[PDB]
């Protein structure tokens, strides 16, 4: 694709607006947007987690207006925010008291907030904390895990092309690919880490590269991808579950001629 001039005019520009619900594991309907309580394995050798215990990458493939009868939709600007940040102030619902007579323990600890806009499926690289971890039937995970899978194994390449499938802890955006995607992610690890969530409708991310070219939507398809593990909920018994929230996306696209 040799990129040429941008189309101008009333009909040269379009907008895509949607939300991605979180895939935290959903152990029963009462706990939608939570993971299952986290079990710790006895040894590295015998680590076989339940499927509803593994948060997954969320993905949306949004069809854009048909262009052919050579134009492509170019993603220019993104607006995004986490939906329902104030829900984390429910500190009265089945929590563990901070101390005697105290309010509930609020959602806190390890968090991963991540969003991507691209003209093709997000490209993943596999890295495993423990290579002998047995990921469950129904998830897509690094196959033929060797000892070198714990630092870097180039065999573990995949496309984020399915929901409730790619576990967060196996997969990261592949920095060797993703030429046609813009991705942003922050892991704030630790056990007592405060969530810091900003909301505003005044903040815009520009998706153009150093050459002034944004993601080009192949087959007139925009690929939105997100993870928002806000932290962990401690319930009365002391058990801890991941809690996640949906993510709003608004993408401005424009028609671009290519050769």
């Amino acid at each position: 694709v040799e990129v040429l001039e941008v189309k101008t005019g009333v009909d040269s520009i379009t907008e895509v607006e949607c939300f991605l619900t979180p895939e935290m594991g959903d152990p029963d309907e009462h706990l939608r947007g939570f993971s299952k309580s986290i079990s710790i394995s006895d040894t590295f050798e015998s680590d076989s987690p339940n499927r509803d215990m593994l948060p997954c990458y969320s993905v949306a493939r949004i069809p854009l207006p048909n262009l052919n009868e050579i134009l492509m939709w170019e993603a220019v600007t993104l607006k995004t925010e986490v939906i329902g940040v104030t829900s984390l102030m429910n500190v009265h619902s089945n929590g563990q008291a901070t101390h005697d007579n105290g309010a509930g323990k609020p959602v806190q600890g390890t968090s991963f907030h991540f969003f991507s806009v691209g003209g093709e499926a997000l490209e993943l690289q596999g890295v495993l904390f423990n290579y002998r971890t047995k990921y469950p039937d129904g998830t897509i995970f690094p196959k033929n895990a060797t000892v070198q899978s714990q630092v870097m194994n180039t065999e573990h390449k995949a496309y984020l092309d399915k929901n409730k499938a790619y576990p967060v802890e196996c997969w990261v955006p592949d920095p060797t690919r993703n030429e046609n995607t813009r991705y942003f992610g922050t892991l704030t690890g630790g056990e007592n880490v405060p969530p810091v969530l900003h909301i505003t409708n005044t903040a815009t991310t520009v998706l153009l590269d150093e050459f002034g070219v944004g993601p080009l939507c192949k087959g007139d398809n925009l690929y939105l991808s997100a993870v928002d593990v806000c932290g962990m909920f401690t319930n009365r018994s002391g058990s801890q579950q991941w809690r996640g929230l949906s993510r709003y996306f608004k993408v401005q696209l424009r028609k671009r001629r290519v050769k």
């Binding site: 619900t21 959903d26 152990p27 029963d28 939608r32 499927r51 039937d137 129904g138 929901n163 409730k164």
Partner: peptide, 11 residues
């Protein structure tokens, strides 16, 4: 089968 947001098969 266990809860699924789509009512998918889990095995």
């Amino acid at each position: 089968e266990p809860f699924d947001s789509s009512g998918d098969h889990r095995g």
